[PDB]
Amino acid sequence: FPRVKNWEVGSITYDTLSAQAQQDGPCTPRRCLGSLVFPPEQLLSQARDFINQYYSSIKRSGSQAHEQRLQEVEAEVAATGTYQLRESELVFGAKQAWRNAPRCVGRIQWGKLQVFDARDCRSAQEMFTYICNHIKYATNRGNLRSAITVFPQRCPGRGDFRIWNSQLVRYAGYRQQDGSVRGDPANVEITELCIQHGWTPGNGRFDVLPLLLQAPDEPPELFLLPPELVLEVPLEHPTLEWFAALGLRWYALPAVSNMLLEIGGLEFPAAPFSGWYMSTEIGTRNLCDPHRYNILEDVAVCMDLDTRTTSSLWKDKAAVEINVAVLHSYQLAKVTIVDHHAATASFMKHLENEQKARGGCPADWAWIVPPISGSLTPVFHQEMVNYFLSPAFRYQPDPW
Amino acid sequence: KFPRVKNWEVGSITYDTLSAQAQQDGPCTPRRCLGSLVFPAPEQLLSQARDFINQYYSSIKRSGSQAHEQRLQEVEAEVAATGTYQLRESELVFGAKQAWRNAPRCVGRIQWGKLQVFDARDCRSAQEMFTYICNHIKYATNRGNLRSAITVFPQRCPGRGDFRIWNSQLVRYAGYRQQDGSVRGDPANVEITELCIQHGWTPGNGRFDVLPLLLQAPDEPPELFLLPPELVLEVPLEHPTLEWFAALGLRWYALPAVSNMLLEIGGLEFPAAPFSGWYMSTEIGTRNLCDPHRYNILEDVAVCMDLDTRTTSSLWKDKAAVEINVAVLHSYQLAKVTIVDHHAATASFMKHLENEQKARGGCPADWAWIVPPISGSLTPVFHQEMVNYFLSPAFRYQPDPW
Ligand code: HEM
Ligand code: HEM
Ligand SMILES: CCOc1ccc(-c2ccc3c(C)cc(N)nc3c2)cc1CN
Ligand SMILES: CCOc1ccc(-c2ccc3c(C)cc(N)nc3c2)cc1CN
Ligand SMILES: C[C@H](O)[C@H](O)[C@H]1CNc2nc(N)[nH]c(=O)c2N1
Ligand SMILES: C[C@H](O)[C@H](O)[C@H]1CNc2nc(N)[nH]c(=O)c2N1
Ligand SMILES: [Cl-]
Ligand SMILES: [Cl-]
Ligand SMILES: [Gd]
Ligand SMILES: [Gd]
Ligand SMILES: [Zn+2]
Secondary structure, X not given: OOEEEEOOOOOEEEOOHHHHOOOOOOOEOOEEOOOOOOOOOOHHHHHHHHHHHHHHHOOOOOOHHHHHHHHHHHHHHHHHOOOOOOHHHHHHHHHHHHHHOOOOOOHHHOOOOEEEEOOXXXXXXXXXXXXXXXXXXXXXXXXXXXXXXXXXXXXXXXXXXEEOOXXXXXXXXXXXXOOOOEEOHHHHHHHHHHHOOOOOOOXXXXXXXXXXXXXXXXXXXXXXXXXXXXXXXXXXOOOOOOHHHHOOEEEOOOEEOOOEEEEOOEEEOOOOXXXXXXXXXXXXXXXXXXXXXXXXXXXXXXXXXXXXOHHHOHHHHHHHHHHHHHHHHHHHOOOOEEOHHHHHHHHHHHHHHHHHHHOOOEOOHHHHOOOOOHHHOHHHHEOOEEOOOOOEEEOOOOOO | OOXXXXXOOOOOEEEOOHHHHOOOOOOOOOOOEOOOOOOOOXXXXXXXXXXXXXXXXXXXXXXXXXXXXHXXXXXXXXXXXXXXXXXXXXXXXXXXXXXXXXXXXOOOHHHOOOOEEEEOOOOOOXXXXXXXXXXXXXXXXXXXXXXXXXXXXXXXXXXXXXXEEOOOEOXXXXXXXXXXXXXXXXXXXXXXXXXXXXXXXXXXXXXXXXXOEEEEOOOOOXXXXXXXXXXOOEXXXXXXXXXXXXXXXXXXXXXXXXXXXXXXXXXXXXXXXXXXXXXXXXXXXXXXXXXXXXXXXXXXXXXXXXXXXXXXXXXXHHHHHHHHHHHHHHHHHHOOOOOEOHHHHXXXXXXXXXXXXHHHOOOOOOHHHHOOOOOHHHOHHHHEOOXXXXXXXXEEOOOOOO
């Protein structure tokens, strides 16, 4: 039972939940790979275990309906080679996958999640409407609400529902006559696919990509997103009057549409989930990463900072002001956003809850500590244990 | 079958083949990663020794030579006759540099080959130990033009106690527990402070009182020694534009000289081998001054800056922290004392990673310690995946001798 210490306070806890981890991770006694981004009778064992989890959490292990539900999945798989989840089970599984996501700093919210059941989806035009209901509900005029839409589970003999976009909202990335990119470089690949499938490319740095939706076996089909459905925030700074003229914007809804939701041995390769942004994701990663919009030097010239020496901390200064502009603009636009100090304090509170509730919490330090001001937040001084519990969200290869 | 390592800023891929030779084992398993934890027989002495001798004779391009097989036989003979063996001077110099090179949490390792090794293995008492230390401080400080150095005292051996430096660093500020339960000075040094008082030291009552040395000769109690004031170069902190900042009375010392770690070379253990380099500005600015459990100045600075400290979304902590780091950099430069900022240091560590990939096929690096504690993703090391593992020769943590 691993001993974990908090260095800010001195306290000690023990992670007894780690003793039950499953689909093993990347590390071995000889070497640690914690920093790397990307590291059939067996269906019945994953299904038994999940069902035991479910009746655990509703104060009802070892009695009528628990016994009975074990039998039906037995008979279902025995007759069909797969099984269907009761609707409450799907809800409970979706929330547990969020609760188990080790890289997620927003899990204090894990019990408030809206699950739209789309398991009876049947076409690409159907998805688009399921997606569009989600986007509408999650956005909610800027009062964001966490939501996931679960499309049909995978099964052999036939294909897969899949969203070729990494997120429901992404900005175009356009190559050049010199390699360089106008727009978002993280999305150059999926932009070529959209053009390659009919889309009429735009001219700008913030052109919202269309959606490439894939119904089983059939080739993808483009979908234009309704402009009023995609809520966006123009970026301005509370006191630097020229910042608005940089023409920067970001969207309101972080909606992740390429991950595979795995519940009880069932695999849903299309289960887009959405929450709300932590400010540093927008300000520091999307706008300042050298391989994203890379605006840091442009903001610093405008602030008349000494870009000639690194010891002036011109990067640090411009980065804070960008983050200020993000928090300021989203607030002025009445769009739910949370700062990395508030976020990390809530996560600390989540760890204390998870300690008493399950004897621990799987956390990936490198992704929990924010990308600016790390040691100024309390999670920096908190030792953490990382491991894989089920149900979970997993990464999957691109559909091509 | 070797780990693939990507740099996300550039798209580069490399494989770390050196990890396969990881000579000891760490805290992680396929069940659970513990990478974020701060603190994770003649035949075996023979095998560690054999491996080190092989390393040494490789570095001088004499692997499998006459002299290489002679040294293997000499060591086996000495371990048989005495249970231990003695390093040649050149082996000690190589092993000390290798230990620095292998330190996974050190971002300064581009410098690993420019290391001044002082051999104090002939040391006989705590009083001689003090003289060696004073000379190390003098050579390394060099009037502010800092130089990396290590002094290595006699090895652990059967029949004798260890030489030990009780202080975690050669230069530290006292931490006085008081009541109301609070600490005046550096809270990290409360324990060693209480030990010094208990061993004869007359404490002060300042926030920046330099601690005496507690030095332990074999089979002896520890002895107190006052550092001569003129040997401890300090930097009063001021800010280039915020002029009230000098009225805080803040200071830091020039020389980071870690003194409580064990150096291991070829199976042999040096429980006393203090080493020193120069500071990266975030150690002083962010960690030593702003940690809530250290000097904890962030709120006071922010109130002074007239930042709105009633809400976190003003980012007052980030703004005050940036100005504290600017003040440290400016102050050390004004004082003509070597200091590197976290951007220059991480950029040179990337060059180190590239040198090391061409030379040994990899580099042990602990991402959570290599990424600076502010502005992480603004430095290039953030976007570099890394493989952590333990090579020998090595610096190791050891229990406090009390
Ligand atoms: C409600 C506010 C939320 C916030 C502030 C938030 C924040 C974050 C952040 C900062 C990351 C780091 C990813 C990175 O930077 O690489 C992350 C990852 C992640 N989030 Fe959350 N998120 C929220 C809601 C949700 C919801 C509703 C779900 C799904 C039900 C979710 C599932 C995940 C998963 C699966 C990951 C990746 C985990 C891993 O790969 O181990 N999050 N989130
Ligand atoms: C020349 C400038 C140097 C710089 C800028 C530097 C920087 C650093 C930093 C920032 C850390 C992490 C400290 C923290 O906890 O925040 C570290 C750790 C460390 N450094 Fe360096 N250092 C330098 C020289 C040296 C030298 C000369 C040695 C030994 C010969 C050394 C050996 C170590 C070791 C052993 C650790 C702990 C690593 C571990 O436990 O794995 N460093 N260094
Ligand atoms: C490791 C591959 O990259 C990612 C993986 C997951 C996410 C992620 C996934 C879901 C999120 C949600 C739901 C909200 C939010 N504010 N941030 C989120 C961030 C971001 C990234 C962007 N680095
Ligand atoms: C787990 C114990 O923590 C440490 C471990 C090593 C060091 C360390 C050790 C040697 C250093 C040297 C030689 C220079 C420098 N700038 N920083 C150094 C930092 C600091 C610390 C302070 N957290
Ligand atoms: C708990 C956590 O791992 C611990 O605070 C580590 C994180 N990274 C660090 N990084 C550096 N450079 N120095 C440190 O002391 C630490 N502390
Ligand atoms: C190379 C490194 O592992 C990689 O950049 C990781 C580290 N930490 C991160 N932290 C956040 N918040 N987001 C990320 O994408 C990453 N990526
Ligand atoms: Cl994003
Ligand atoms: Cl220090
Ligand atoms: Gd101007
Ligand atoms: Gd001023
Ligand atoms: Zn690990």
